[PDB]
Description:
Layout (H helix, E strand, L loop, with lengths): L15 E6 L2 H16 L4 E8 L1 H9 L5 E5 L3 H4 L11 H16 L1 E3 L9 E6 H6 L5 H9 L6 E4 H5 L4 H8 L8 E4 L4 H10 L6 E5 L10 E3 L12 E6 H4 L5 H10 L3 H12 L5 H11 L5
Amino acid sequence: HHHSSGLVPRGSHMQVAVSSKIDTEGGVLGNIILTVLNANGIKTTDRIQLGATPVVRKAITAGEIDIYPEYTGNAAFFFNKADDPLWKDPAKAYETAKKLDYDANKIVWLTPSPANNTWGIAVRKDVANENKLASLSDFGKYIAGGGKVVLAASSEFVNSAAALPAFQTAYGFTLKPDQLITLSGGDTAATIAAAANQTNGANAAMVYGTDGGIAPSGLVVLEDDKHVQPVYQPAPIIREEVLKKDPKIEELLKPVFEKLDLTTLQDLNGRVQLGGEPAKAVAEDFLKKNGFLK
């Protein structure tokens, strides 16, 4: 519990510019941050869904925005450490992102969500339930044992060394030609839809962990328990100049992001993306339901 008096002069004023990247999850997480700050007496400006990652990074380093949700693994790209094994360890990825961004930019990484929004595989819920599949280790054993699988994936996912081939060696399986639907120029919208509709027998799909299509389509993400992919946990990151004046922002956002687990964020993103609920309303509902809006 930080102090909220005596830190700055009587006349100190601030408008906290809240932003995000220009995807569904950015809208959801940005509105969660904005709503929490507003509810705790802090003035904000709404710059949510400003642009792609490079745009938002340029904006925060220029002091044009103050706080937005960023993903731990992206620090690999910001600081020229791509494919370093540490990014595949959730704790190391977070601590390293936090240290690098503080040292270079005095940007403070706050408490992350436990959701790992990374490349992966989701299966139809009936398949997961009947065969007790929760993890990619489970999945690999199931496939190796002769389990029925037809995976819809983009060509990139099938053929890039870091994608399906790496899943195959980590989890001990290989997919035969008749266990693959390969989508040239495809995307997760199409792979999710193929699995949702069992197109050509599809029962699994290439996804990103919190894709808004997953929950509405009745799919379930299998845990990357050996972390084949780099970890991308979202966290609020904030300019130190702003945090120093309202340091309570840290403890205000901590239990909020702790409650945003994978299935929760999946649900919120789906409510916007396929349910048509406004991101602000979805954010407010999540906050009210979990007691963060007294």
